[PDB]
Amino acid sequence: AFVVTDNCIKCKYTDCVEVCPVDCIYEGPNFLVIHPDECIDCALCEPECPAQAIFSEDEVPEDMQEFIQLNAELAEVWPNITEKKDPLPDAEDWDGVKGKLQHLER
């Protein structure tokens, strides 16, 4: 499974959803997640993320291990997104800011 981590929060560029062949991405107010059961590990999304927030499960940084299980949990409750949309207004102010998990909205 590929996993979306911290830097997607408050950026949500959604470029990853264009490229996903199986549409396994689910949408929240300010963050996106990958459904681990549905992802086919094609890796096409991670070159596409401008925030470089997507990682292969086995490459998730040590300090972002929470995100693996978070993607599995939220993907069960959030709606599927299948079309790109605009980034959040202020996405490049928040791009590269650390510790954005305290701003995650359900």
Only one of the segments 37-45, 70-78, 83-91, 94-102 lies at the binding site for ligand SF4 (rule: CB under 6 A); that segment is 37-45
Query: Can you say how many angstroms the Cα of residue 85 is from the centroid of all Cα atoms in its chain?
Result: 14
Whole-number Å distance between alpha carbons of 31 and 106: 9
Which of 4, 20, 24, 60 forms a contact with ligand F3S (CB under 6 A)? 4
Contact between 38 and 93 under an 8 Å Cβ cutoff? The reply is: no
Rounded to an integer, what distance in angstroms lies between the CA atom of residue 84 and that of residue 30?
Answer: 14
The reply to whether 24 sits in an annotated binding site is no
Stretch that binds ligand SF4, among 15-23, 63-71, 78-86, 88-96 (CB under 6 A): 15-23
CB of 31 to ligand SF4, least distance (A): 14
